[PDB]
Design a binder for this molecule. Sequence first.
Ligand code: 964
Ligand code: MG
Length: 283
Amino acid sequence: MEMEKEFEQIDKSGSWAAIYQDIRHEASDFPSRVAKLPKNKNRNRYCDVSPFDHSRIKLHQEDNDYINASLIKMEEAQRSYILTQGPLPNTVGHFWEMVWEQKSRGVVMLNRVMEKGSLKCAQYWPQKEEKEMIFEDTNLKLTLISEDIKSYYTVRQLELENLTTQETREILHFHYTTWPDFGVPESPASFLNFLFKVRESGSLSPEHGPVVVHCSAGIGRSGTFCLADTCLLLMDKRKDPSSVDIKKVLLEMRKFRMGLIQTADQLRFSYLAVIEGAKFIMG
Ligand SMILES: CC(=O)NCCSSCCNC(=O)[C@H]1CC[C@@H](NC(=O)c2nccnc2C(=O)O)CC1
Ligand SMILES: [Mg+2]
């Protein structure tokens, strides 16, 4: 494929940092006024990772509608994603409120609760079935129904209950547990297989609200997940799969949330993920 030849070109010339800088310079810039508001300071994890106003998800409460989350709407691929930060101790209720209101079926987690000896994420789901979580601020109940631990990922069945109305929904929690503390994975095989597993569950399908994807900031590994999935979908859809430009898709995604793909090594990994992922469907 012509993407692999472009990949081999940048590899031989060692210009991954230069290509990544080009994207960084070309990337969209939009206001994040609501995010920067002083009352929303404790709702943000990082000062430099904000949702654009135009694509931000609004909570259905008149008090404070703010959550650090962006709707990425891919028109041509017919796919939507919510990218958000790993919830904070104070925003765990907000997080599940969004899952409920947006009618999400799947939650994709691409980090461990602890990485590099620091807390990257609040423990926002129950670890034992007998110990449910109740979120008093958003009036929601969350129960672990089942857990399936595998070598590279863990899938959890969760029940989310709106306590005001008593409706229940099954939420699928897809947790990629083997992303290395430093850098990117050596082989995209595990990541791609994880992707296919999320796909197979119907969590990315149009009959459901957009999947909720997060890592620490919801931009680095989260960007990779959405970029790979969209590129692969487009190669299936288009007349001429070679016309899929990963850089062009990324820049289109960057219109909805900042900083998707954080390093040149993450971009290289994305290429590899798309290249290897295509080879699984095209032999
Ligand atoms: C002032 C205030 O309120 N905020 C206080 C914190 S604001 S400064 C934080 C320091 N800057 C960073 O390194 C950011 C850069 C952007 C983002 N990077 C990643 O996505 C990432 N980080 C860690 C591990 N993996 C990744 C990955 O690539 O996915 C999160 C970390
Ligand atoms: Mg037990």
